[PDB]
């Protein structure tokens, strides 16, 4: 599949303007009628621009398109937090029934407040323990920027085995979520006084602790 | 106004992937419909539309593997993708498109006007496996309590979780799944509620894993001991 050339990432500050380019040959971008699409995680793609410069229905004026030869540009002014998304261009190639898409440009909006993660930690359920399994569930939400590291402690000792942690993902409030699962035997779980899920975000570590004596 | 994808979430290598798009809110006979897919972190990929023009194979990978048809009696647009490999794993979108030749030099106009929600398709030989569902009881905090459900060891994606049959949406947070070295997924859904409501309100998570026809309603309550 042919792909149009886009920068992998762009950044702009709150209230400022950013430009995203879409580069191809005389037979795709050079034919004009480039379109632009906004992909926000968890939502259907949204058409922003078509025909190089025409805004789709519902799209405010601060989204504008232009073209200079074989490079088309999407410009977003008055950046706000909700503009963080992946932006894809497209155009027909050789026929009106064949589209080529760009590789996508991820937009980061700078100047936003740091937001520390909220942590919820669940011990293994009595049902799971009866099934001879045990899972500690560490749920991490409402953090920005979207990067955390997770460390598990048994009492105060590090645990490395049995840990699976997700990539961070956008929530619906512009912040990020992640989850970490620690798999233990019921014997391991009961053999310690407590377990802790420690989440480090931008150099600050937040934690929760659970103990096998709690009811679950 | 509506583009509803349907079809299997799991297909085995070498088989044919068949999806359906059921349209509503416009005359299907008078609008182009196209299939677009996206692999995680990769570019959108055009598969085909209900109206092909020109005569070329602009994609060696999809060379003669795609068939798109329109069934006007059912307001349905079909996709057939033959001889799938694991590379065909992706989210498949039904779209409404504008296709024009504008011209004098012929210039080709093609853009997507509307996008469906997308349907996740995993190509794999692994068998489907339904989840085990465990309650995550609320513990002993600003007047609120967190309770949830653990949806453990299922394949393939996706899983849906509702609470109280959809009546409860405020304070619900369903987290993306983790993928374990076993090849199985686990996710959790948590709902934040007033601590005072724990003695007068019942909380049930409704887990639906379509690929395995698994439907579980799990009551989540405080636990005493």
Residue numbers in the entry:
A (entry chain L): 1 to 9, 11 to 27, 27A, 27B, 28 to 95, 95A, 95B, 96 to 106, ...
B (entry chain H): 2 to 82, 82A, 82B, 82C, 83 to 101, 138 to 174, 178 to 262
Give passages from the manuscript.
The cow antibody repertoire contains a unique subset (~10%) of antibodies possessing ultralong CDRH3s, which can reach lengths between 50 to 70 amino acids. The unique CDRH3 structure can be separated into two microdomains where the antigen-binding disulfide-bound “knob” sits on top of a long b-ribbon “stalk” and can bind to both surface and receded epitopes. Ultimately, we isolated a total of 8 and 11 cross-clade nAbs from cow-485 and cow-488, respectively, all of which had ultralong CDRH3s, suggesting only ultralong antibodies were responsible for cross-clade neutralization detected in sera. BnAbs from cow-485 were named Bess, while bnAbs from cow-488 were named ElsE and assigned numbers based on their order of discovery.
The ElsE Fabs all have CDRH3s with 54 amino acids and 4 cysteines, with a 1–3, 2–4 connectivity, Bess7 has a 61-amino acid CDRH3 with 8 cysteines (1–6, 2–5, 3–7, 4–8 connectivity), while the 55-amino acid CDRH3 knob region for Bess 4 (6 Cys, 1–3, 2–5, 4–6 connectivity) has no ordered electron density in the crystal structure. Ultralong bovine CDRH3 knob regions fold with 3 short β-strands connected by 2 loops (Loop1, Loop2) of varying lengths that can adopt a multitude of different secondary structures, including loops, helices and β-turns. The ElsE series of Fabs all have highly similar knob structures as expected from their high sequence similarity. Flexibility in the stalk is evident in a comparison of the ElsE family of structures that have similar CDRH3 knob sequences and structures, but very different orientations of knob domains with respect to the body of the Fab. The ability of the knobs to twist and rotate with respect to the body of the Fab likely enhances the ability of bovine Fabs to access recessed epitopes. There is no convincing electron density to indicate tyrosine sulfation modifications in any of the antibody CDRH3 regions; however, BLI experiments indicate that Bess7, with 3 tyrosines in CDRH3, contains one or more sulfated tyrosines. Low sulfate occupancy or flexibility in the CDRH3 knob region may explain the lack of electron density for these groups. The ElsE lineage was the most potent and broad overall.
